[PDB]
Design an enzyme around this catalytic site. Structure first.
Site, mmCIF file in Angstrom:
data_model
loop_
_atom_site.group_PDB
_atom_site.id
_atom_site.type_symbol
_atom_site.label_atom_id
_atom_site.label_comp_id
_atom_site.label_asym_id
_atom_site.label_seq_id
_atom_site.Cartn_x
_atom_site.Cartn_y
_atom_site.Cartn_z
ATOM 1 N N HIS A 279 6.028 6.767 6.325
ATOM 2 C CA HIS A 279 5.619 6.484 4.981
ATOM 3 C C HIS A 279 4.951 7.706 4.410
ATOM 4 C CE1 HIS A 279 2.188 5.812 7.571
ATOM 5 N NE2 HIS A 279 1.465 6.297 6.563
ATOM 6 N N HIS B 91 0.820 -1.208 0.000
ATOM 7 C CA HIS B 91 0.000 0.000 0.000
ATOM 8 C C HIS B 91 0.849 1.252 0.000
ATOM 9 C CE1 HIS B 91 -0.247 -0.205 4.538
ATOM 10 N NE2 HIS B 91 -0.429 -1.495 4.294
ATOM 11 N N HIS C 49 3.879 10.767 6.782
ATOM 12 C CA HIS C 49 3.399 10.450 8.131
ATOM 13 C C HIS C 49 4.536 9.764 8.866
ATOM 14 C CE1 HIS C 49 -0.986 10.277 6.594
ATOM 15 N NE2 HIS C 49 -0.564 11.503 6.867
ATOM 16 N N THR D 141 -5.281 6.051 9.179
ATOM 17 C CA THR D 141 -5.970 6.240 7.874
ATOM 18 C C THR D 141 -6.014 5.051 6.991
ATOM 19 O OG1 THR D 141 -4.013 7.197 6.766
ATOM 20 C CG2 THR D 141 -5.455 8.727 7.986
ATOM 21 N N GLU E 213 -3.666 13.312 2.280
ATOM 22 C CA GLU E 213 -4.819 12.836 3.049
ATOM 23 C C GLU E 213 -5.494 14.007 3.749
ATOM 24 O OE1 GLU E 213 -3.537 9.249 5.230
ATOM 25 O OE2 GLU E 213 -4.536 8.213 3.530
ATOM 26 N N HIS F 16 1.872 9.165 1.393
ATOM 27 C CA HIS F 16 0.709 8.991 0.569
ATOM 28 C C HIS F 16 0.869 9.908 -0.609
ATOM 29 C CE1 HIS F 16 -1.537 6.980 3.854
ATOM 30 N NE2 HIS F 16 -0.708 7.672 4.585
HETATM 31 O O LIG Z 1 -1.697 5.926 6.648
HETATM 32 ZN ZN LIG Z 2 -0.252 7.392 6.635
#
Ligand SMILES: [O-]
Ligand SMILES: [Zn+2]
Length: 258
Positions: free
Chosen positions: A92, A62, A117, A196, A104, A94
Protein backbone atom coordinates in the site's frame (compact mmCIF):
# COMPACT_ATOMS: atom_id res chain seq x y z
CA UNK A 1 -11.40 0.66 16.12
CA UNK A 2 -12.19 4.30 15.36
CA UNK A 3 -8.70 5.66 14.51
CA UNK A 4 -7.99 7.46 11.23
CA UNK A 5 -6.27 10.55 9.83
CA UNK A 6 -9.07 13.03 10.36
CA UNK A 7 -9.47 16.17 12.37
CA UNK A 8 -10.31 14.23 15.60
CA UNK A 9 -9.03 10.66 15.28
CA UNK A 10 -5.55 11.14 13.72
CA UNK A 11 -2.02 10.19 14.86
CA UNK A 12 -1.94 12.48 17.85
CA UNK A 13 -4.91 10.61 19.32
CA UNK A 14 -3.84 7.03 18.72
CA UNK A 15 -2.00 6.66 22.03
CA UNK A 16 -5.27 6.61 23.98
CA UNK A 17 -6.39 3.25 22.57
CA UNK A 18 -2.85 2.11 21.62
CA UNK A 19 -0.43 3.24 24.32
CA UNK A 20 2.54 1.66 22.46
CA UNK A 21 2.23 4.73 20.28
CA UNK A 22 4.64 6.39 22.71
CA UNK A 23 6.96 3.37 22.77
CA UNK A 24 10.67 2.92 22.21
CA UNK A 25 10.67 1.47 18.70
CA UNK A 26 8.00 3.49 16.84
CA UNK A 27 7.86 4.23 13.12
CA UNK A 28 8.27 6.18 10.98
CA UNK A 29 11.38 8.25 11.73
CA UNK A 30 13.42 10.97 10.14
CA UNK A 31 16.56 9.53 8.53
CA UNK A 32 19.47 11.95 9.23
CA UNK A 33 21.76 11.01 6.41
CA UNK A 34 24.87 12.28 8.21
CA UNK A 35 24.22 10.27 11.33
CA UNK A 36 23.31 6.94 9.63
CA UNK A 37 26.29 4.66 9.63
CA UNK A 38 27.45 2.64 6.63
CA UNK A 39 27.49 -0.95 7.75
CA UNK A 40 29.81 -2.86 5.46
CA UNK A 41 28.38 -6.00 7.08
CA UNK A 42 24.96 -5.47 5.50
CA UNK A 43 24.15 -7.53 2.47
CA UNK A 44 22.45 -6.78 -0.79
CA UNK A 45 18.76 -7.14 -0.41
CA UNK A 46 17.29 -10.09 -2.24
CA UNK A 47 13.91 -9.16 -3.67
CA UNK A 48 12.47 -12.34 -5.28
CA UNK A 49 9.17 -11.41 -6.96
CA UNK A 50 9.39 -13.51 -10.14
CA UNK A 51 6.73 -15.92 -8.94
CA UNK A 52 4.49 -13.34 -7.24
CA UNK A 53 0.69 -13.91 -7.34
CA UNK A 54 -1.30 -10.71 -6.87
CA UNK A 55 -4.97 -11.42 -6.08
CA UNK A 56 -7.11 -8.47 -5.08
CA UNK A 57 -7.10 -4.71 -4.30
CA UNK A 58 -9.05 -3.50 -1.32
CA UNK A 59 -9.97 -0.05 0.00
CA UNK A 60 -9.78 -0.59 3.78
CA UNK A 61 -10.81 2.91 4.78
CA UNK A 62 -7.25 4.11 5.39
CA UNK A 63 -5.38 3.14 2.18
CA UNK A 64 -5.72 0.57 -0.53
CA UNK A 65 -4.01 -2.77 -0.22
CA UNK A 66 -2.80 -4.89 -3.17
CA UNK A 67 -2.97 -8.39 -1.72
CA UNK A 68 -0.84 -11.36 -2.71
CA UNK A 69 -1.02 -15.13 -2.24
CA UNK A 70 1.13 -15.59 0.85
CA UNK A 71 0.25 -19.31 1.31
CA UNK A 72 3.64 -20.33 -0.26
CA UNK A 73 7.03 -18.82 -0.77
CA UNK A 74 6.36 -17.07 -4.09
CA UNK A 75 7.27 -13.40 -3.53
CA UNK A 76 9.89 -13.20 -0.81
CA UNK A 77 12.31 -10.75 0.73
CA UNK A 78 15.63 -12.09 2.09
CA UNK A 79 19.13 -10.82 2.68
CA UNK A 80 19.95 -7.26 3.57
CA UNK A 81 19.66 -7.07 7.42
CA UNK A 82 17.32 -10.04 7.59
CA UNK A 83 17.70 -13.63 8.68
CA UNK A 84 15.36 -16.05 7.07
CA UNK A 85 12.61 -15.60 4.61
CA UNK A 86 9.75 -13.07 4.57
CA UNK A 87 6.62 -13.52 2.40
CA UNK A 88 4.96 -10.57 0.67
CA UNK A 89 1.43 -10.18 2.01
CA UNK A 90 0.35 -6.79 0.58
CA UNK A 91 1.55 -3.39 -0.47
CA UNK A 92 0.00 0.00 0.00
CA UNK A 93 0.86 3.66 -0.12
CA UNK A 94 0.73 6.72 2.03
CA UNK A 95 0.20 10.09 0.35
CA UNK A 96 -0.63 13.71 0.84
CA UNK A 97 -3.20 16.31 -0.15
CA UNK A 98 -0.42 18.10 -2.02
CA UNK A 99 3.01 16.93 -3.34
CA UNK A 100 4.88 18.55 -0.41
CA UNK A 101 3.79 15.92 2.09
CA UNK A 102 2.63 12.28 2.09
CA UNK A 103 5.69 10.16 3.04
CA UNK A 104 6.00 8.65 6.50
CA UNK A 105 9.78 8.46 6.58
CA UNK A 106 11.60 11.67 5.86
CA UNK A 107 15.22 12.20 4.75
CA UNK A 108 16.96 15.12 6.48
CA UNK A 109 13.40 16.33 7.20
CA UNK A 110 12.44 16.22 3.51
CA UNK A 111 8.91 14.86 2.90
CA UNK A 112 8.12 13.04 -0.32
CA UNK A 113 4.76 13.13 -2.10
CA UNK A 114 4.09 9.50 -1.19
CA UNK A 115 5.66 6.30 0.17
CA UNK A 116 5.08 2.73 -0.86
CA UNK A 117 5.25 -0.06 1.73
CA UNK A 118 5.73 -3.69 0.66
CA UNK A 119 4.87 -5.70 3.76
CA UNK A 120 6.40 -9.10 4.36
CA UNK A 121 6.15 -11.59 7.27
CA UNK A 122 8.69 -14.04 8.61
CA UNK A 123 7.79 -17.61 7.66
CA UNK A 124 9.33 -18.98 10.83
CA UNK A 125 6.15 -17.76 12.60
CA UNK A 126 3.74 -19.49 10.24
CA UNK A 127 1.13 -16.72 9.85
CA UNK A 128 0.98 -12.93 9.81
CA UNK A 129 -0.88 -12.76 13.05
CA UNK A 130 1.83 -14.62 14.89
CA UNK A 131 4.55 -12.66 13.15
CA UNK A 132 3.29 -9.26 14.39
CA UNK A 133 3.80 -10.42 17.98
CA UNK A 134 7.58 -10.88 17.41
CA UNK A 135 10.43 -8.33 17.20
CA UNK A 136 11.65 -9.89 13.94
CA UNK A 137 8.17 -10.74 12.62
CA UNK A 138 7.91 -8.28 9.65
CA UNK A 139 10.13 -6.74 7.02
CA UNK A 140 8.70 -3.68 5.30
CA UNK A 141 10.35 -2.32 2.10
CA UNK A 142 9.74 1.42 1.91
CA UNK A 143 10.06 3.31 -1.37
CA UNK A 144 9.63 7.07 -1.72
CA UNK A 145 7.60 8.63 -4.55
CA UNK A 146 8.44 11.98 -6.10
CA UNK A 147 6.37 13.70 -8.73
CA UNK A 148 7.84 14.03 -12.23
CA UNK A 149 7.65 11.47 -15.01
CA UNK A 150 5.02 8.77 -14.96
CA UNK A 151 5.85 5.34 -13.52
CA UNK A 152 4.55 2.89 -16.17
CA UNK A 153 4.33 -0.03 -13.72
CA UNK A 154 2.04 2.00 -11.53
CA UNK A 155 -0.69 2.66 -14.04
CA UNK A 156 -2.55 -0.61 -13.64
CA UNK A 157 -2.99 0.31 -10.01
CA UNK A 158 -4.14 3.86 -10.73
CA UNK A 159 -6.60 2.73 -13.37
CA UNK A 160 -8.49 0.42 -11.05
CA UNK A 161 -9.03 2.93 -8.17
CA UNK A 162 -12.34 4.23 -9.51
CA UNK A 163 -13.67 0.72 -8.81
CA UNK A 164 -12.76 0.72 -5.13
CA UNK A 165 -13.59 4.31 -4.30
CA UNK A 166 -15.02 3.71 -0.86
CA UNK A 167 -14.15 1.74 2.27
CA UNK A 168 -14.89 -1.99 2.05
CA UNK A 169 -14.81 -2.17 -1.76
CA UNK A 170 -12.51 -4.67 -3.45
CA UNK A 171 -11.71 -5.67 -7.04
CA UNK A 172 -9.90 -8.54 -8.67
CA UNK A 173 -6.24 -7.59 -9.15
CA UNK A 174 -4.50 -10.63 -10.66
CA UNK A 175 -1.33 -10.66 -12.72
CA UNK A 176 0.21 -7.47 -11.33
CA UNK A 177 4.06 -7.47 -11.20
CA UNK A 178 5.39 -5.48 -8.26
CA UNK A 179 8.87 -5.41 -9.74
CA UNK A 180 7.63 -2.49 -11.85
CA UNK A 181 7.34 -0.38 -8.68
CA UNK A 182 11.03 -0.63 -7.75
CA UNK A 183 13.72 2.00 -8.42
CA UNK A 184 16.94 1.10 -10.24
CA UNK A 185 19.13 0.93 -7.11
CA UNK A 186 18.48 -1.18 -4.01
CA UNK A 187 20.73 0.88 -1.76
CA UNK A 188 18.89 1.24 1.59
CA UNK A 189 18.73 2.40 5.16
CA UNK A 190 17.56 0.02 7.88
CA UNK A 191 16.38 0.31 11.46
CA UNK A 192 14.11 -1.56 13.98
CA UNK A 193 10.68 -0.14 14.17
CA UNK A 194 6.93 -0.68 14.18
CA UNK A 195 3.75 -0.84 12.13
CA UNK A 196 2.75 2.76 11.29
CA UNK A 197 -0.93 2.07 11.80
CA UNK A 198 -2.67 0.88 14.89
CA UNK A 199 -1.97 -1.49 16.57
CA UNK A 200 1.49 0.05 16.17
CA UNK A 201 3.20 -3.25 17.11
CA UNK A 202 6.97 -3.12 17.42
CA UNK A 203 7.59 -6.02 15.03
CA UNK A 204 9.19 -4.48 11.92
CA UNK A 205 12.61 -4.44 10.35
CA UNK A 206 12.35 -1.30 8.18
CA UNK A 207 14.28 -1.27 4.92
CA UNK A 208 13.91 2.15 3.23
CA UNK A 209 15.31 2.57 -0.32
CA UNK A 210 17.43 5.66 -0.88
CA UNK A 211 16.33 6.14 -4.55
CA UNK A 212 12.77 7.41 -4.97
CA UNK A 213 10.61 6.35 -7.88
CA UNK A 214 9.02 9.04 -10.12
CA UNK A 215 5.34 9.06 -10.65
CA UNK A 216 3.30 11.63 -12.58
CA UNK A 217 1.12 14.31 -11.07
CA UNK A 218 -1.86 12.66 -12.79
CA UNK A 219 -1.03 9.32 -11.11
CA UNK A 220 -0.93 10.79 -7.62
CA UNK A 221 -4.02 12.96 -8.31
CA UNK A 222 -5.88 9.75 -8.88
CA UNK A 223 -4.86 8.41 -5.45
CA UNK A 224 -6.39 11.59 -3.97
CA UNK A 225 -9.85 10.88 -5.42
CA UNK A 226 -10.34 7.87 -3.21
CA UNK A 227 -12.56 8.10 -0.12
CA UNK A 228 -11.98 7.16 3.48
CA UNK A 229 -15.72 6.87 3.90
CA UNK A 230 -18.09 4.12 2.93
CA UNK A 231 -20.53 4.12 -0.04
CA UNK A 232 -23.04 6.91 0.09
CA UNK A 233 -21.58 8.55 3.20
CA UNK A 234 -20.40 12.19 3.34
CA UNK A 235 -17.38 12.26 1.00
CA UNK A 236 -14.01 12.50 2.82
CA UNK A 237 -11.15 12.38 0.35
CA UNK A 238 -8.43 9.80 1.17
CA UNK A 239 -5.52 12.23 1.58
CA UNK A 240 -2.83 12.69 4.26
CA UNK A 241 -2.92 9.08 5.40
CA UNK A 242 0.57 9.30 6.83
CA UNK A 243 1.84 9.14 10.41
CA UNK A 244 4.56 11.77 11.12
CA UNK A 245 8.07 10.98 12.18
CA UNK A 246 8.44 9.59 15.76
CA UNK A 247 11.32 9.87 18.16
CA UNK A 248 14.31 7.73 17.27
CA UNK A 249 15.27 7.00 20.90
CA UNK A 250 17.90 4.44 21.38
CA UNK A 251 18.12 3.33 17.77
CA UNK A 252 20.70 3.25 15.06
CA UNK A 253 19.91 3.68 11.38
CA UNK A 254 22.33 1.71 9.20
CA UNK A 255 23.14 2.40 5.53
CA UNK A 256 23.91 -0.34 2.99
CA UNK A 257 26.00 2.04 0.90
CA UNK A 258 29.22 3.87 1.57
O1 LIG B 1 1.31 1.72 7.21
ZN1 LIG C 1 2.38 1.64 5.45
Amino acid sequence: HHWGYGGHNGPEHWHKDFPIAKGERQSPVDIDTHTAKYDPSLKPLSVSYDQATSLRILNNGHAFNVEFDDSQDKAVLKGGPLDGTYRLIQFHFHWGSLDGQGSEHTVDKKKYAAELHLVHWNTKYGDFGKAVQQPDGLAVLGIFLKVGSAKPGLQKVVDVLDSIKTKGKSADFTNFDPRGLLPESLDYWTYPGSLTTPPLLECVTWIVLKEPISVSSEQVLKFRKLNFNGEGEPEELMVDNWRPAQPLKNRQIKASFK
